[PDB]
Amino acid sequence: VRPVWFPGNPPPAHLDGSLAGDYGFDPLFLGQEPQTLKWYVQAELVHGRFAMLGAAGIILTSIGAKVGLGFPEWYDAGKVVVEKNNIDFPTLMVIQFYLMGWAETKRWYDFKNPGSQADGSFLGFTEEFKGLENGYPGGRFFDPMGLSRGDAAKYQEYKQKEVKNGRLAMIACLGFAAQYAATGKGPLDNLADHLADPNHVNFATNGVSIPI
């Protein structure tokens, strides 16, 4: 009864509806086993969140670029700023890897042992380093605004909208990637051009998308 991505075909076995965005879409049966399925759930969540980040950053920098504010284009900002300031590739990379490794291995051993992270083995902390769901570590910090502890219906709706916008952001970031690698240009600029003439400023005329 749930809207099935392929209207007319029934969902497979493991795809049920308990999770957010269960449009019955796993035509490759990649989620029969519940271990692997919870696993790919956490994977999809983190990826959607990263994509939401990336889209926001790219679009804001691109606006700042079109407007006369000197902001570079995203695929160059890195080199341009690292050469601007007195930064070292090695030191930046190593500090980044340090901190990310710490936080991420903590999340990992939490997924392994679902409770052993708020065990006070930290500084003194507990009731915050303890998970709430598989990939939903809302405590006093990861949900400091405290919506997870109120109006479970509204909370479910928020999980739904979160995963929806996450999938959209993933698709849009890949959009950006192709836009740039094809038009050798700025994304917002390609946008303005297709605005100028949708009939002719489009992939049908980009002469690469359609290789004819």
């Binding site: 809207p3 099935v4 209207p7 007319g8 075909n9 009939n199 002719h200 489009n202 049908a204 005329t205 359609i210 004819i212």
Partner: protein, 202 residues
């Protein structure tokens, strides 16, 4: 069932030990689909020729049908408010939708008026029979008043559709051999029933 003459000299409608695509249901379904297509295609292939012969349309249009762009080597036309490919694309998406949902109907009967579709489901309920769902749109006027008249109409449809398939093949063969237009061939064979013929075209 409609339009049979007992004529199946090759005998494929045999309903026993059937399977795959060879099954009278799907087969006659394909026949009626082709009939409706060929009807539309014949009407189109002809229309602009005579329409410009009567001169009611600007001579800018009314080029011969095989030149409108489908085969650029056969000659292309231009002036369309967009590119052939830019049109081809939206054509892809629209036909994808229509054909796919018709197929989902035929494969899981009645199951294509259920998923929320902007209220555009009650019409897609139709009959339990492909090629004849009827419903408010697909039978706009309540046609088939007498069921005798209904069978009569189905018969007439299959008749005209087979005629149309024949006519479309005729257009193809003439336009390849004599290279002219269809109405061109007509005007000629009219001018000379004897000296405007495939015998003359040898």
């Amino acid at each position: 069932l409609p339009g049979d003459f007992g004529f199946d000299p090759l005998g494929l409608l045999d309903p026993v030990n059937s399977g795959g695509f060879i099954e009278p249901k799907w087969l006659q379904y394909s026949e009626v689909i082709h009939a409706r297509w060929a009807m539309l295609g014949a009407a189109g292939c002809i229309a602009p020729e005579v329409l410009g012969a009567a001169g009611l349309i600007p001579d800018a249009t009314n080029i011969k049908w095989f030149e409108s762009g489908v085969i650029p080597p056969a000659g292309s036309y231009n002036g369309y408010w967009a590119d052939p490919y830019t049109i081809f694309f939206v054509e892809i998406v629209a036909m994808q939708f229509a054909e796919l949902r018709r197929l989902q109907d035929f494969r899981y009967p009645g199951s294509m008026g259920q998923q929320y579709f902007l209220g555009l489901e009650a019409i897609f309920k139709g009959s339990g029979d492909a090629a004849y769902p009827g419903g408010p749109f697909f039978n706009l006027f309540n046609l088939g008043k007498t069921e005798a008249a209904m069978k009569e109409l189905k018969l007439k449809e299959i008749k005209n559709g087979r005629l149309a398939m024949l006519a479309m093949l005729g257009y193809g063969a003439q336009a390849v051999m004599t290279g002219k237009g269809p109405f061109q061939n007509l005007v000629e064979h009219l001018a000379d029933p004897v000296n405007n013929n495939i015998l003359t075209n040898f």
